[model samples]
Target: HLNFTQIKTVDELNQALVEAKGKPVMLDLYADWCVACKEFEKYTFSDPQVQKALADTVLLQANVTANDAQDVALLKHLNVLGLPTILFFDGQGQEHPQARVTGFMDAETFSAHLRDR
Candidate 1:
């Protein structure tokens, strides 16, 4: 399993982003109702290569299962349109939009992204 620190609110995410400065960060927007998110976790994240590639990054997950106010605010703050979104922030804590993944990817594909970014 991909161990991640759970972020519940926009303030917490902001704090995480600040703390993640000088290190690569990966923010995963997940939801219980999102099948693609589950597929990413089951198929891609489970792969050894994917795990290795992401091992150095700070992994953060926002589970919007409840879709509550904090969840909505967090999603809005990130300008995320849907679940299963994987966002990569560089060592400077600046988001890399080109590395954003809005859908499920295979291990190889995800690994390539991890390497390329």
Candidate 2:
């Protein structure tokens, strides 16, 4: 399994981002009920190449499976519309909206996408 830093709130996410300053960050939004999210975990994240590609990046996971108040708030803060969403942040702590991932991507495809960043 990937070593993802789990966060539950927007403040926590922001703090994690601050702590990971000057580093590339990958914020993965996941939910237990999201089939695509499970696929990402079983197939994409488990890929060797995918792990290697993310070796130097900060990995953060937001589990919104419960969909509670805090979870909903966090989702709203990120403006996320659905599960299995991936948001990437550059070293400068700026997210590339164009690089957002909304659906499942194969290992090689995701690897290439990260490589481009």
Candidate 3:
């Protein structure tokens, strides 16, 4: 399993971004009810190549299973509409909308994405 830093609040996310200090950061939106999220964890994230590709990046996950106030606020801050959304941030913590992944991607495809973005 990937060792993801759990981010629950918007403030926490902001803090993590600031702490990243120009490093590429990846934020994964997940929910227990999301099948695609589970697929990503089970398939793509578990791949050796994909894991190596993401090794250098700061990984963060937001578990929205409860969908509580903080969860909703965080989603609103990120402008995330649903689960299984993987957002990529550049060195400056700015999200690349073009690189957003909303569906389950296999290991090879995900590796390519990491390379390009």
Candidate 4:
């Protein structure tokens, strides 16, 4: 499977169900200009273990800070109070979310979060 799908609108997120059907989802709720988020995309996600986990799950990126109307709506709807929030959604696209990991996490701890469910 491809690594993760970056969704910019509510429609895309809703449609995520079609592609993600029975799979686990990792939503990377981020701020487009956030520095830490950039670091994770560059470093954390490239880790070997993170790469392995990708094979078993689906990844989605929801940017909280965007100009588009739908994206702005989703940012509020999801109650994304902060930056770099990674939410885990189960098979049905429900926000089967976990606690907010506020900052950048190393690969080991990040892997642990993925393992929680």
Candidate 5:
């Protein structure tokens, strides 16, 4: 099973990133009404390839289901334009240029995306 730290605010995310140290980090933006988010949870996340690909990666999920002030601030800070946005950070804490997933991707494609990183 995959584990993702629940992030609710900027401080929480920053803390999670700090704790990740030199490990790769994956930040997922999710909303209850987001169609792609649901699809991703059911398809991409459920895939074993995806699980294995991220075995050692740090996972963080921000739930914006309520669309509250904290969620708005997080989204604005990250410059996220849509839901189901998955941002990847390298060991050095820089976001990877490749495989910034913005929508629902299948197991093969998502795993390949991780492989490319």
Candidate 6:
């Protein structure tokens, strides 16, 4: 299984970004109390293909239900308007304005996105 890490605070997220250096980053925008999000996690995360593809990236989760200004700003910057939004960012913490992939995906496809595409 891929050890996808979740970030709960603006500080923690920023620290993660800094630590990632020039590596690729993926953001999972989820709600703190969303059932659908949990369901997605159960099905999507269990895919072995997805786990293999995510082996080389930095992953983090952003909670929308929290009243965190940092999260809000980052979300706005990334133009995320939905829960379970997935974003691909560069090492500089800037979201690839044109490279965002949202919602859940089968593990194999996710791995391909991370590897081949």
Q: Which candidate wins on lDDT? A: 2
Query: Tens-digit lDDT track for model 6 on 1-117?
Result: 446677866677778989997888887777867665775577666776676666677878777787478668767766677666677777666766556656565656556565643
Clash number for each model: 0, 0, 0, 0, 0, 2
State the displacement of the C-alpha of residue 73, model 4, in Å, after optimal TM-score superposition: 0.6
CA-only RMSD, every prediction: 0.9, 0.7, 0.9, 2.4, 1.2, 2.9
TM-score on alpha carbons, each prediction:
0.96, 0.97, 0.96, 0.82, 0.94, 0.71
- List, residue by residue over 5-103, the lDDT tens digit for candidate 3: 999999999899999967999999999999999899889999999888888899999999999999999999889878779998889989889899988
Q: Give the number of colliding residue pairs in candidate 6.
A: 2
Candidate 5 lDDT at 27 equals 94
Count backbone clashes in candidate 3. 0
Candidate 4 on 25-49: residue-level lDDT in tens?
Answer: 7778777788888878777787888
Q: Pick by TM-score: which candidate is best?
A: 2
Candidate 5, residues 1-117: lDDT per residue as tens digits? Answer: 468889999888888888897999999999899999888889989988899889999999999999999999999988888787999988877886465888788999888888887
Two-way TM-score contest, 3 vs 4, winner: 3
Return the TM-score for candidate 6, rounded to 2 decimals. 0.71
Task: Flag regions of model 3 displaced more than 4 Å.
Answer: none
Q: Once model 6 is optimally superposed onto the true structure by TM-score, how far is the C-alpha of residue 24 displaced, in angstroms? A: 1.6
lDDT of 1 by residue, 48-81 (tens): 9998888889999999999999999988988998
Candidate 4 lDDT trough over 10 residues, lowest sum = 93-102
Q: Residue 10 deviation, candidate 6, in Å?
A: 4.5
lDDT of 3 at 62: 92
Model 1 clashes, total count:
0
lDDT (C-alpha, whole model) for all candidates:
0.90, 0.92, 0.90, 0.75, 0.88, 0.70
